[PDB]
Amino acid sequence: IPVLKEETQHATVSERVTSRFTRSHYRQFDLDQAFSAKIFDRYLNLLDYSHNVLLASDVEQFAKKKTELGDELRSGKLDVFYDLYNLAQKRRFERYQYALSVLEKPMDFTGNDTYNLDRSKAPWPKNEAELNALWDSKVKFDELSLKLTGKTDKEIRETLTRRYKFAIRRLAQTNSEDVFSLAMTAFAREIDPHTNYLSPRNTEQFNTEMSLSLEGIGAVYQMDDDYTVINSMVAGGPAAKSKAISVGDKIVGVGQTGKPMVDVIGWRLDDVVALIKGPKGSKVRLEILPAGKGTKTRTVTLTRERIRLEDRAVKMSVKTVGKEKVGVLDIPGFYVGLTDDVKVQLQKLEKQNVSSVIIDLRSNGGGALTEAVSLSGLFIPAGPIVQVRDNNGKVREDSDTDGQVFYKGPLVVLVDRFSAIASEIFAAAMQDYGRALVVGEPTFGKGTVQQYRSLNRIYDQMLRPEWPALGSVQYTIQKFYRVNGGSTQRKGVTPDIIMPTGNEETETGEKFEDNALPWDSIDAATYVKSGDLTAFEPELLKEHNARIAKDPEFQNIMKDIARFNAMKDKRNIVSLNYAVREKENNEDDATRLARLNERFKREGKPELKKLDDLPKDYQEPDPYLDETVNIALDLAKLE
């Protein structure tokens, strides 16, 4: 395999990269030895997430000088990363040699053995034997996954073999930029988890340009390990519009109209992503493992489009209970024109004489801070909305100037785990003004913005035919603050009323993220509260808690939360006993089929004969919305 080598331009990029982070990142940090040490470890974990490749012998050879990397990045002298990447690429190959062998060996799932899915805290293997034991276990796990999939012994040995060959092929497919990226990745993600190095565009982009404006599914992908994951969906992109794939789901397989389905376990991110993308109005076939460690996969077929703005658009509806009326705005995202679209929706809402109005920001990871401000100000007359703090410690206060409220009546803002930024600042501000009730779950808590700078400076193509282009940096320039003076960072907005889901722990939120910047305050801005809704909390809670206690969906929701607690201590570990696993799957299905048919009883639908039979258009009801409509009407009555 051609040995990977830093390219000439890399030197300067490193210098330029290090400049910007060191000096201009929101976070005032010391790129000292200690900092360097942590990077080193972070890089190691990139090379070998699973700590089942590198030999402990190898590790210390590089580890003894982990404090050098500060100066190394500054002087653009990066061979330490490259030598260690070239190692651990060598060793990765040793693994695949072994693993192919073990496929041949006959295998039985009769024994009571187990598999741990998190070796991130594990010991670095000490010797050949230990490697072979760990790799034996990986192969056994893969064979079983496919047996439970429903593949035959033969095709299991064939399909695993294919994957491992591609891993070897890939090993040689990678290149200098791939290494360098990864070095930057180690540096970037040690300042905070939203700082990034974005590699330049290659030939492949050029063909995108000869190709159309513009070709994707509006999901933002990254990678932990062998497995690709979704962090973000773009509002009104087909991913989001399908409502099938979600945040956190792992992608395992992609396909086209003619061709059979293609395994993407253990890839380079670029390669998985490339396979997805297609000419507009195309289709693509997608295969996902929901959440984590479900061990069951579903298929999602994406009508490839390019974002229709009416998919992007605010959607208005009017719910009714008895004779009472509740305007509902689903606002997908904080799009330009939101506040104007909203003003027009308020027009229809006054025709219909609604007694209260829900703003539904659920799974709305933001958009324009501009629009967030405008909207806040439709419900408060004039006043500050948000405090913006920059990479100089300077504070800007963004405010509404209308001395007008376009809608005066009660207001609920409904938020969840995945509500973010503009949603959070609007939700925060509605709380701080005591102008609305918040309902749902703790919000994501992303309280910072980033920006891109190009690494290209104007003189590069007068003084070079280096035209390899340089990449960009993306990094924290601002932290957002409430008008109460708390940041939304890590805590987000905590609703007045927590729906059942929000009373537990979770995998997700800015707070659970690797090295997220900590919560803090600044001094409260000066505002004119629009009312006080603390009087109303106990009767609101009392009736809310009562209603959902008698409610089938909330009852079911509770059990699945209770069950989650009861069994979640045993998540990391899976049985390698085939029949246990098949029984786990079978017990799932029974639970599921019973729960759906129960629903259909109450909905007056004909009951399901099998779970096999669920139509692939099938949508869940919305317990939270229904209940929030109720809370909204209570609130209207209370005033």
Author numbering: 32 to 670
From the article:
Prc (also named Tsp) is a member of the family of C-terminal processing proteases (CTPs) which features an embedded regulatory PDZ domain inserted into a serine protease domain. In Escherichia coli, Prc is involved in degrading abnormal proteins that are unfolded or partially folded and marked cotranslationally at the C terminus by an SsrA tag and that are exported to the periplasm through the Sec translocon. By associating with its adaptor protein, NlpI, Prc is also involved in the regulated proteolysis of MepS, a lipid-anchored hydrolase specific for PG cross-links. The activity of Prc strictly requires the PDZ domain, and the PDZ deletion completely abolishes the protease activity.
We determined the structure of Prc-S452I/L252Y, which is indeed trapped in the unliganded resting state. In the structure of Prc-S452I/L252Y, the PDZ domain is docked inside the bowl, interacting with residues, mainly from NHD and CHD, dispersed across a wide region; these residues constitute a total interface area of 1,595 Å2. Interestingly, the docked PDZ domain makes little contact with the protease domain; the only contact is made between the stacking side chains of PDZ Val278 and Phe449 at the back, and this contact anchors the PDZ domain in a specific position to expose the ligand-binding strand b4. The two-β-stranded substrate-binding hinge, which is formed in the activated state and which connects the PDZ domain to helix h9 and the platform, is unfolded into two coils; the critical substrate-sensing residues Leu245 and Leu340 are separated and become solvent exposed. Helix h9 is drifted away and partially unfolded to make up the large vaulted space above the platform. Lastly, without a folded connecting hinge, the proteolytic platform is angled down with misaligned active-site residues: the catalytic Lys477 and Ser452 are apart from each other, and the amide groups of Ala453 and Gly398, forming the oxyanion pocket, are out of place. We found that limited V8 proteolysis indeed resulted in the two fragments from Prc-S452I/L252Y but not from Prc-K477A at various incubation times, supporting the flexibility of helix h9 in the resting state. For Prc-S452I/L252Y, crystals were obtained in a solution containing 0.2 M sodium thiocyanate (pH 6.4 to 6.8) and 20% PEG 3350. The crystals of Prc-S452I/L252Y were found to be merohedrally twinned with a twinning fraction of 0.42, as determined by the Phenix tool Xtriage and as subsequently checked by the CCP4 program TRUNCATE.
